[PDB]
Paper text:
To further counteract the effects of conformational heterogeneity within the large capsid particle, we optimized the reconstruction by using the “block-based” reconstruction (BBR) and in situ single particle analysis (isSPA) methods. Sub-particles around the 3-fold, 2-fold and 5-fold axes were re-extracted for BBR. The BBR method relied heavily on the initial translational and rotational parameters obtained from the icosahedral reconstruction. To avoid using these parameters and further improve the local resolution, we processed the 3-fold axis region and 2-fold axis region with isSPA methods. Finally, the resolution of the 3-fold proteins was improved to 4.5 Å, and the resolution of 2-fold proteins was pushed to 5.18 Å, respectively.
The M segment of the virus encodes a polyprotein precursor that is sequentially cleaved by cellular proteases during transport to the endoplasmic reticulum (ER) to become mature two glycoproteins, Gn and Gc. Gn and Gc assemble into a heterodimer on the viral surface, with Gn forming a capsid spike and the Gc portion located below, closer to the lipid membrane.
Numbering used by the authors:
A (entry chain B): 155 to 296, 320 to 332, 344 to 409
B (entry chain A): 257 to 307
C (entry chain A): 308 to 409
D (entry chain B): 1 to 296
E (entry chain A): 22 to 256
F (entry chain B): 1 to 52
G (entry chain B): 257 to 296
H (entry chain B): 104 to 154
Write the structure that this text describes.
């Protein structure tokens, strides 16, 4: 066999890629469907919807993928609880470990699908099934916010000592500035009031290091 | 209701105790607020009060 | 022996061996946190001038001495009012200038 | 009061319980015109005797357009969790043909039957791994049992009602002749009959009406703010609507334990693998799915 | 039914069963509930031979149907005591009963706890005919014959030889259990999360596992896994 | 991060399990604007005590 | 009280709440509902 | 529809064949009778004529 797993979403909504930083220091990845108010569960926090600043429409299509991973394919991709006439998926079977042979009950046949014909002595085999390819194929692939749970929040002398300045105002990234500090404790910093552009959120180790952050201004203050 | 289940009901010295005492067990709505201290009476249990 | 086999508990990105895996009833306790809080507080209300009538605009100078994040309703004057600003943030020293037709 | 109408005291039945001050008991019907907003209307009482009489003051305060809660339902925040106990064959001894009957509440497989933190999650077998890779040395495949939870760790609850109408109504304060003052909100555009004490107020003139689409109110229990939506609602959760889980006890609206609230067939995303099943979901949050306004 | 054999029936009750070095001899002895009687002679002080003709074929447990009971190959915590894996301990007054079962004609029941495993006893002739802690004298139990009448075990526990985990791995489970149960603060007096004042009467039932450390671990989002491999001990 | 929003620490319940370093447990809701792609957004936590 | 007289299905306006039910009605008086004359 | 054994067995009903029914259920600390599962409510309707 060459096995394909399929799902009929029949929709398209924007979504993104998110990496997360627990205050402890954990980093866990996931993909939130932030166009839909989906709630992905992990640890203590959950992220949810954003702004659908652009949307588009598309016909009834959905994805076809192969287990050996030949490539990825797209089709009209009709799917339901049963195999309707003339669709891409006739045998719809629900166990990969039992997807090599046909032994699990979950997967469901078609009435009079197989071509048995008789003779004067004995019967011969034929079929009317169609392969996934070249039967109905229409293409071939070449305000983020979060809710807080019951957190596990945890809990001296320190000098700033800047060193240099870079160049950006009114560019979508901002200019990058480097500061060389030292502190006897592991800590986090906070905003400069007169910087007048954005806040601060730096974190340091107990040595002399530098951590550089991005900002933009007309004139340095 | 409070009953010794042997020689009938509890005593007045007993039922008055069993609104202050901590050994006579009972069902719920009697332990959340009235405080069944649930003395582990393996033998000869004190008189139980229910609804 | 007629046994199913060894047990391994995998629980949220971990692989752990149980010495004894089991279920049992336990004696526990529960807690409660009382709901509700209340607020009131003097406010300065004064009127510089008035041009009420049919015209929507009026000059009213009222204030608030409070810190609450959520601001409640407001009310109306005689002859059938409904101020377009009934709820307005009450955290800081922000005066409120309403409009009427009184 | 500027507009004032006296009673019709022709109904006369007074018992002289005391001679210094009389007593009487009467009823009837009255028709007083609507007063302008911000003012109170009166109602005069008369007795065949001269010296004593009373009054009743009806004060209006506001004119607005609200609609009556024909129903009421709560909505928790659903999450999809799923477990998997993976026996293998001759070791779980589970039937060669998976039993088509499934006990959806007990699950004797893992600790007999107890309270289930899911609201009627489903059951099933699966395909079977068998051989040296899964390691329990039997050739024939192995059934796997799976759960799905609809859960709510820290909910934010919304109560909703589909009036699907808009009729004028007002604000009324009332003055019993004794001296009582009881408030209430009459839906005086509709001939509703609010009950209190002895009197009941009813309909007024709908001197202006307007039309509006199928919308109704969404409110939050912590009271974040107030929200509006198309707000479809019925006895069941129809496809693509705002409210899927419709649950009828606030004290039981934190968890999912009361029977009154009703699930969706195959709503939770259980998918299998060669070892064990993983969780997904297709539910939609109330916000940004079908939202046509936001209250200032 | 029997792991190996049906346990012997010897009329003369006054006999103390001795030690054996053999591995495949003590299991059928464990099938006979021999070990639990030794606990009485050690803590209850009674020479009560327990469960004639009973074995593991008639013993009953509080949950109505126990799949683990069907499997005699698995091992129950009170039977982890003969083999030296775990040891059951006495009961303190601050420890309380669970009002679940019908405590009629008992002398020894188990209750797994957050810390360890607890066993309770009464006197010989002190029949247990009520759920209370008080034990009641009666001559109706003079005969030692009882089909697990005095032996009723709470819970459905599986046990096995185990290999430990590092200390930090233990600390990960302890914190994660705290997060999943925001409401739960106090259990058995042992702190789970420090909170404000708490009520008392509430029985509590979640699954648990032990990995060789002091604090028990509970779960609601767990996935198990069943592997059987040829181990010389498992023969 | 260029866009940054601090928490609402008005929910205060901290148990002094240790004196040298404190402990606290809190929850809530937050509304942070969407950041441009390729950059990270922050979220600041505050405590009534100063240093940490 | 006599059986001879005959009701209407779901004519009376019962509606529920979270505690208890309240009364309403949809019946119409004989007058001013469909009246085409009035005898002098 | 005629007796209503719930409230005083069966007697003369001042309604002409009013209906019957259960309802949805309040349950919890708010309604105060401490059971989790909901509560049925029984209702009458009168068609009446004072004067
Ligand atoms: C009740 O008390 C009994 C005596 O205090 C005790 O018998 C003792 O059992 C231990 C079991 O470990 C024996 O210890 C020796 O033998 C085992 C194997 O049998 C070895 O592995 C040990 O290393 C050790 O050498 C003791 O010898 C034995 N006592 C006597 C006098 O022989 C019971 O086990 C106790 N029962 C309970 C339930 O606590």
């Amino acid at each position: 066999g060459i096995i394909w797993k399929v799902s009929p979403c029949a929709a398209w909504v924007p979504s993104a890629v998110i990496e997360l930083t627990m205050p402890s220091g954990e980093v866990r990845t996931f993909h939130p469907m932030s166009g839909i108010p989906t709630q992905v569960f992990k640890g203590v926090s959950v992220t949810y919807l954003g702004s659908d600043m652009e949307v588009s429409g598309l016909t009834d299509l959905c994805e076809i993928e192969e287990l050996k991973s030949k490539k990825l394919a797209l089709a009209p991709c009709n799917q339901a609880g049963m195999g309707v006439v003339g669709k891409v998926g006739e045998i719809q079977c629900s166990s990969e470990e039992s997807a090599r042979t046909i032994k699990k009950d979950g997967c469901i046949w078609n009435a009079d699908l197989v071509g048995i014909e008789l003779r004067v002595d004995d019967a011969v085999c034929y079929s009317k099934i169609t392969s996934v390819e070249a039967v109905a194929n229409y293409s071939a692939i070449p305000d983020i916010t979060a809710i807080r749970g019951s957190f596990s929040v945890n809990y001296a002398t320190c000098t700033g000592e800047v060193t240099n300045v870079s160049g950006c105002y009114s560019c979508m990234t901002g200019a990058k500035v480097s500061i060389k500090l030292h502190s006897s404790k592991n800590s986090t910093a906070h905003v400069r009031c007169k910087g007048d552009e954005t806040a601060f959120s730096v974190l340091e180790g107990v040595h002399s290091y530098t951590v550089s952050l991005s900002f933009d201004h007309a004139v340095v203050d | 209701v409070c009953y010794k289940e042997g020689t009938g009901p509890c005593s007045e010295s007993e039922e008055k105790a069993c609104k202050t005492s901590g050994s006579c067990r009972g069902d719920m709505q009697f332990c959340k607020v009235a405080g069944c201290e649930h003395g582990e009476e393996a033998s000869e249990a004190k008189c139980r009060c229910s609804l | 022996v007629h046994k199913p086999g060894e047990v391994v508990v995998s629980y949220g990105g971990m692989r752990v061996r149980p010495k004894c895996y089991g279920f049992s009833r336990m004696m526990a306790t529960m807690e409660v946190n009382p709901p509700e809080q209340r607020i009131g507080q003097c406010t300065g209300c004064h009127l510089e001038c008035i041009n009420g009538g049919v015209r929507l605009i009026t000059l009213t100078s009222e204030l608030k001495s409070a810190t609450v994040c959520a601001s409640h309703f407001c009310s109306s004057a005689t002859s059938g009012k409904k101020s377009t600003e009934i709820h307005f943030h009450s955290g800081s020293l922000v005066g409120k200038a309403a409009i009427h037709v009184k | 009061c500027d507009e004032m109408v006296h009673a019709d005291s022709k109904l006369v039945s007074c018992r002289q319980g005391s001679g210094n001050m009389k007593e009487c008991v009467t009823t009837g019907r009255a028709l007083l015109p609507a007063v302008n907003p911000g003012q109170e209307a009166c109602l005069h009482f008369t007795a065949p005797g001269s010296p004593d009489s009373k009054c009743l003051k009806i004060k209006v305060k506001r004119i607005n357009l609200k609609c009556k809660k024909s129903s009421s339902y709560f909505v928790p925040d659903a999450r999809s969790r799923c477990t998997s106990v993976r026996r293998c064959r001759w070791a779980g001894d589970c039937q060669s043909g998976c039993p088509p009957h499934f006990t959806s509440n007990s699950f004797s497989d893992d600790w007999a039957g107890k309270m289930d933190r899911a609201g009627l999650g489903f059951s099933g077998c699966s395909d079977g791994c068998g051989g040296a890779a899964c390691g329990c040395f039997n050739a024939a495949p192995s059934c796997i049992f799976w759960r799905k939870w609809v859960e709510n760790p820290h909910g934010i609850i919304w109560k909703v009602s589909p009036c699907a109408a808009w009729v004028p109504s007002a604000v009324i304060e009332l003055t019993m002749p004794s001296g009582e003052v009881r408030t209430f909100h009459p839906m005086s555009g509709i001939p509703t009959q609010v009950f209190k004490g002895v009197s009941v107020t009813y309909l007024g003139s709908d001197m202006e009406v307007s039309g509006l689409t199928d919308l109704c109110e969404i409110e939050e229990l912590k009271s974040k703010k107030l929200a509006l939506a198309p707000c479809n609602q019925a006895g069941m959760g129809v496809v693509g609507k705002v409210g899927e889980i419709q649950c009828s006890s606030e004290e039981s609206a934190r968890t999912i334990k009361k029977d009154g609230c009703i699930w969706n067939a195959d709503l939770v995303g259980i998918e299998l693998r060669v070892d064990d099943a993983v969780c997904y979901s297709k539910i939609t949050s109330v916000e940004a799915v079908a939202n046509y306004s936001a209250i200032p | 039914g029997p792991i190996i054999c049906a346990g012997p029936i010897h009329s003369n009750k006054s006999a103390g069963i001795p030690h054996l070095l053999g591995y495949s001899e003590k299991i059928c002895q464990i099938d006979r509930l021999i070990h639990v009687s030794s606990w009485l002679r050690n803590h209850s002080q009674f020479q009560g031979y327990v469960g004639q003709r009973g074995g593991r074929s008639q013993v009953s447990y509080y949950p109505a149907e126990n799949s683990y009971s069907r499997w005699s190959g698995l091992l129950s915590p009170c039977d982890a005591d003969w083999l030296g894996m775990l040891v059951v301990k006495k009961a303190k007054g601050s420890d309380m009963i669970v009002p679940g079962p019908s405590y009629k004609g008992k002398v020894l029941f188990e209750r797994p706890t957050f810390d360890g495993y607890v066993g309770w006893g009464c006197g010989s002739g002190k029949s247990r005919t009520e759920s209370g802690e008080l034990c009641s004298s009666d001559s109706g139990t003079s005969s030692g014959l009882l089909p697990s009448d005095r032996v009723l075990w709470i819970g459905d526990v599986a046990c096995q030889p185990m290999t430990p985990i590092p200390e930090e791995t233990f600390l990960e489970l302890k914190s994660f259990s705290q997060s999943e149960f925001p409401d739960i603060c106090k259990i058995d007096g042992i702190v789970f999360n420090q909170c404000e004042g708490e009520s008392l009467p509430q029985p509590f039932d979640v699954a648990w596992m032990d990995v060789g450390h002091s604090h028990k671990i509970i779960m609601r989002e767990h996935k198990t896994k069943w592997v059987q491999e040829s181990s010389s001990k498992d023969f």
